[PDB]
């Protein structure tokens, strides 16, 4: 049955959460390759700050390294270690423009 | 230390996962209101199918209802029950 207000708010306030990021989006210079898997599970700042004049952005960043299969058509494949940026702590901040 | 290939693949294959959806995106006709919270945690089909000719889409859908504060400036506020679409099972399909 129904999820109460206080639960929804707390679970949907700006915090780091497991997000599925496409590898291409992160490394766009690496186009020769086909990546398996094509995306990876990273912690990224999502959720809402409950104000149009504020955005949810990271403060504490870190790195995580994942074994990724990198296929290079008509050439060869291999398991390469690829590093990805993660978010450890998020905060609500003003939109700069 | 390093996450192995088989773990990354399995965790990043098309499956339903907790995604944070903006309420406006779901109900765009309701513009008079300001929603608190402005977004909600729903299960939606994410992840990759590992093929450019395929996309990850839902098969089994369901509904979940959440108490949301709906402010209507210079008028009044209230806790209204708002329904949202969820995904229970995903499958890889052609575009």
């Amino acid at each position: 049955e129904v999820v109460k207000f206080m639960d929804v708010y707390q679970r949907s306030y700006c915090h780091p959460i497991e997000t599925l990021v496409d590898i291409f989006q992160e490394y766009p210079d690496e186009i020769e390759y086909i990546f398996k898997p094509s995306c990876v599970p990273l912690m990224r700042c999502g959720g809402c700050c409950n104000d149009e004049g504020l955005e949810c952005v990271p403060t504490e960043e870190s790195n995580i390294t994942m074994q990724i299969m990198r296929i290079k058509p008509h050439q060869g494949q291999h398991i390469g270690e690829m590093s990805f940026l993660q978010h450890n702590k998020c905060e609500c901040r003003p939109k700069k423009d | 230390e390093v996450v192995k290939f088989m773990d990354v693949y399995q965790r990043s294959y098309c499956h339903p996962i907790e995604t944070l959806v903006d309420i406006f995106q779901e109900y765009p006709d309701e513009i008079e209101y300001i929603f608190k919270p402005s977004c909600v945690p729903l299960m939606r089909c994410g992840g990759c199918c590992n093929d450019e000719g395929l996309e990850c889409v839902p098969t089994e859908e369901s509904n979940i209802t959440m108490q949301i504060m709906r402010i209507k400036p210079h008028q009044g506020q209230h806790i209204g029950e708002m329904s949202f679409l969820q995904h229970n099972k995903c499958e890889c399909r052609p575009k």
Epitope: M6, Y9 | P73, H74, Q75, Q77, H78, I79, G80
Partner: antibody
Framework: EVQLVESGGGLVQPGGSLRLSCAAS????????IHWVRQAPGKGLEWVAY????????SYADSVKGRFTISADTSKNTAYLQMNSLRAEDTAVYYC???????????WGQGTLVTVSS | DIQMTQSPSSLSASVGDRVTITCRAS??????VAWYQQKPGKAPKLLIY???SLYSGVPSRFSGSRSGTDFTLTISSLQPEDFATYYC???????????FGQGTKVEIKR
């Protein structure tokens, strides 16, 4: 010209009932909402209860919940606070105030004095 | 419950002096705070809302400001008719719709 007017406060025996009336003028009381706020002698301001007639939504403060009842006659352009089972602590000055952007109160009533004593 | 804690409790200043009333929130309220002015024997009058914006018809000397939890009403040129009790008020729905502080009785020095 906007104004809120309250009435019906006075002396009541503990455990007694007492009904407060907040009479709106100069705005569509249908298309807006009202707070009740009370202020005990010397002490500061405390939220009692709230109503938003358009969506028949109503909410009360814990210390009051179950004992008071907010209503509103949209026809009469009037809000009511029905107070049952009054205690010594319920002695206060009762203000109704109409609701401003995203919270806050812009227009307040003159305020009626409810005094619970035997 | 969200606790709004006003400082000081009472306060006297001279005519024309700068007066600073602070109001400290327990947990983040956002910019959802209002300041009121209650004369003796009358109802509160709204001065500031959304922490910083001035209500229509309030003289300019009254000015609200913020520091991520510490909210601050500032009367820039105190005047004898500013003698009053000043209340901060937080909203942002959490459990209650809003909450007040204990007040700040201002006085005039002459």
């Amino acid at each position: 010209e906007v104004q809120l007017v309250e009435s019906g406060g006075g002396l009541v025996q503990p455990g007694g009932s007492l009904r407060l009336s907040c009479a709106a003028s100069g705005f569509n009381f249908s298309s807006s909402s009202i707070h009740w706020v009370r202020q005990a002698p010397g002490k500061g301001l405390e939220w009692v209860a709230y109503i938003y007639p358009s969506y028949s939504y109503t909410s009360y403060a814990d210390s009051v919940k179950g004992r008071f009842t907010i209503s509103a006659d949209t026809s009469k352009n009037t809000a009511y606070l029905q107070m049952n089972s009054l205690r010594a602590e319920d002695t206060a000055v009762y203000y109704c105030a109409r609701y401003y952007g995203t919270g806050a109160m812009d227009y307040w009533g003159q305020g009626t004095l409810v005094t619970v004593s035997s | 419950d969200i606790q709004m804690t006003q400082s000081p409790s009472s306060l006297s200043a001279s005519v024309g002096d700068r007066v600073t009333i602070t109001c400290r929130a327990s947990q983040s309220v956002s910019s959802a705070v209002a300041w009121y002015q209650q004369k003796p024997g009358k109802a509160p009058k709204l001065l500031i809302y959304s922490a910083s914006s001035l209500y229509s018809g309030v003289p300019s000397r009254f000015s609200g400001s913020r520091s991520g939890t510490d909210f601050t009403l500032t009367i820039s040129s105190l005047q004898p008719e500013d003698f009053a009790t000043y209340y901060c008020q937080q909203y942002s729905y959490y459990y209650y719709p809003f909450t007040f502080g204990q007040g700040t009785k201002v006085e005039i020095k002459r």
